[PDB]
Ligand SMILES: Nc1ncnc2c1ncn2[C@@H]1O[C@H](COP(=O)(O)OP(=O)(O)O)[C@@H](O)[C@H]1O
């Protein structure tokens with residue numbers, strides 16, 4: 001009899017190349033069978049009809065019924081790789097930053113502007129031509145403005161008058177672009193936002209991908225905070241740069257993975273001013289186009305499953 005690992009996510013994710021690469025490798029474990037829950041079943045069937053599993057790998061993305069995944073986990077009590085309730089919090093940048101602070105993790109100085117959509121002028125914002133004051137806290141330009149929804153990627157950077165003013169509007173990468181300059185110098189006046197200090201990097205962001213708290217792959221890409229043209233190679237793949245995490249950063253990854261209870265977890269680091277600042281925690285995310293990562297990730301995940309469950313299945317497993 002096999003230990004069943006259930007994969008529960010939207011089809012765009014469950015059928016993605018990186019997912020398939022990892023699942024084929026997990027299936028190589030003699031005592032593990034992988035079951036990928038059909039999207040039609042996730043959306044349309046009650047949880048009582050979902051397939052059984054002993055270990056559940058499940059994560060929210062656009063369109064995913066997290067309430068149902070939570071109810072399923074409560075019903076069946078599988079070993080859960082990425083905690084489901086924490087995925088409600090990962091959707092809200094305010095909650096993410098609160099957790100990071102509680103863990104003593106360095107992050108940009110920030111302030112939350114909560115705006116009542118019925119009374120949008122009543123919020124705690126004062127605006128000058130070269131700064132904002134949010135709950136009384138001053139942010140001189142350049143500063144960053146992020147929608148409180150972590151699913152909203154319309155992050156704006158505001159340039160100081162000394163640099164010509166205006167703003168950089170970032171967005172989910174569309175073909176050749178990740179951002180565009182706007183002459184608009186004043187901040188958005190509807191919605192709630194986090195305002196934060198701009199951290200000067202060498203022009204790259206470091207992307208970190210954990211598989212448990214003791215494995216983290218990192219790589220760098222050109223910051224969209226720059227001009228916004230995406231760098232691509234011959235095959236049309238976005239250019240990435242090699243990164244090795246230092247001791248401080250390996251600890252950050254350990255903390256993020258455990259604090260958010262996401263075994264598989266992606267987050268962003270800004271290397272600025274001799275330190276490394278977390279600016280974004282995304283939860284479930286795989287590295288793409290690395291055979292070594294696919295090998296390592298599947299081995300780690302299978303080993304986690306076996307360590308946890310081999311005893312109750314009476315399967316021999318050493319340490
Ligand atoms: N405080 C900051 N200082 C400098 N750059 C930042 C800062 N915050 C975010 N950025 C830039 O904006 C990009 C997008 O912001 P991020 O918080 O990662 O939002 P998203 O969830 O949309 O990926 C980051 O990858 C980084 O290039």
Ligand SMILES: [Mg+2]
Pocket residue numbers: 026027028029030031032033
């Ligand atoms: Mg197998």
Ligand SMILES: [Mg+2]
Pocket residue numbers: 268280
């Ligand atoms: Mg990000």
Ligand SMILES: [Mg+2]
Pocket residue numbers: 150280281282
């Ligand atoms: Mg994000």
